[PDB]
Design a protein around this ligand. Structure first.
Ligand SMILES: OC[C@H]1O[C@@H](O[C@@H]2[C@H](O[C@@H]3[C@H](O[C@@H]4[C@H](O[C@@H]5[C@H](O[C@H]6[C@@H](O)[C@H](O)[C@@H](CO)O[C@H]6O)O[C@H](CO)[C@@H](O)[C@@H]5O)O[C@H](CO)[C@@H](O)[C@@H]4O)O[C@H](CO)[C@@H](O)[C@@H]3O)O[C@H](CO)[C@@H](O)[C@@H]2O)[C@@H](O)[C@@H](O)[C@@H]1O
Length: 298
């Protein structure tokens, strides 16, 4: 069925030894195509992103490309660890643009107590200057994004009350209602342990195309695909049984976290989806899917 095609056998972005904030790893990047350019807001750590390596701090960098493969990168992070909720940094951003404003949801990792991580919101007009809007849901949660437009006059968000993908609605982004689970793990498969969104969903004629990730019982992360109904995105029209992307290359299989492909961003240019993904929580790669190749067996 659906399979992402890698544009390169090499990463499109790698850590940079000269800059402490991105010395160890760059991964799990937001992505958006705007004004003729691919833009990445990428997660970066000073240390390998696991407790076994040390007290890593995640910050958000900016990179830009004309072709979606060769990137230029800014020397400093566009968002750094500023609040108490962000003591251990900002993780796994997802960005959409609605009416001239970029809405970035990210995980603020505090680690002051058990499950001290929260979905936070920041907005920008330019992807460089970010204004914090605070915690979105005051509960242990992550893997969140707005839909790229309002549905029936309402903001809609995906989130992940472990281990399932959830949806919720809001008039003003301040209070949320109609919480319901939309996607769950399937036992004795590649997607048994947990699920979560990839990048933000993409609107097509047949429905909302949503890339999701899942872990198996050996903690191998892969990507999958689902189609949601346009008017009621809680309804799953189709879900592909097989993954669309798996760890295959050396920099996907080996790194700080072995056997991981993980996406927080899918940019669109001329009916081609550019899916950016972290490899082994260490580097960033890219793989494509043409709109016309979005075909579900059901
Ligand atoms: O966003 C922060 C951080 O998230 C990372 O991934 C998430 C998660 O991280 C670990 C931890 O997750 C715990 C729990 O951890 C397991 C184990 O649990 C303890 C105890 O905490 C539980 O209460 C108890 C069950 O009642 O079991 C105990 O054994 O602790 C181990 C050591 O810390 C850890 O290896 C085990 O995975 O796992 C459950 C799901 O199974 C989580 O819901 C729960 O939050 O969270 C802390 C921060 O609070 C982290 O420091 C730990 O690394 O790991 C999950 C997979 O196991 C993953 O799904 C979560 O996303 C990374 O994404 C990282 O990059 C990021 O900085």
């Amino acid at each position: 069925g659906i399979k992402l095609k890698r544009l390169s056998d090499k990463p499109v972005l790698m850590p940079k030894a000269e800059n402490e904030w991105e010395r160890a790893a760059v991964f799990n990047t937001a992505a958006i195509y705007d004004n003729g350019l691919f833009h990445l807001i990428y997660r970066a750590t000073d240390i390998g992103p696991h407790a076994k390596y040390g007290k890593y701090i995640s910050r958000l960098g900016y990179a830009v490309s004309k072709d979606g493969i060769n990137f230029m990168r800014l020397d400093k992070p566009v968002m750094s660890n500023e609040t108490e909720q962000e003591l251990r940094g900002l993780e796994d951003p997802r960005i959409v643009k609605i009416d001239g404003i970029y809405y970035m949801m990210y995980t603020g990792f505090g680690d002051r107590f058990q499950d001290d991580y929260r979905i936070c919101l920041a907005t920008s007009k330019n992807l460089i200057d970010w204004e914090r809007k605070g915690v979105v849901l005051d509960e242990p949660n992550k893997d969140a994004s707005l839909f790229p437009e309002k549905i029936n006059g309402k903001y809609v968000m995906l989130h992940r009350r472990y281990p399932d993908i959830w949806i919720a609605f809001s008039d003003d982004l301040k209070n949320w209602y109609d919480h319901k689970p939309i996607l769950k793990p399937i036992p004795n498969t590649w997607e048994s342990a947990r699920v979560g969104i990839g990048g933000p969903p993409i609107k097509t004629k047949d429905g909302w195309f949503l890339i999701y990730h899942a872990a198996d019982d050996n903690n191998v992360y892969r990507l999958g695909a689902v189609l949601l109904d346009l008017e009621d995105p809680s309804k799953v029209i189709a879900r592909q049984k097989e993954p669309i992307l798996e760890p295959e290359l050396g920099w996907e299989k080996e790194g700080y976290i072995p056997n991981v492909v993980f996406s927080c961003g899918n940019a669109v240019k001329d009916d081609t989806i550019y899916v950016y993904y972290g490899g082994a929580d260490t580097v960033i790669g890219v793989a494509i899917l043409e709109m016309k190749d979005i075909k579900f067996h059901h």
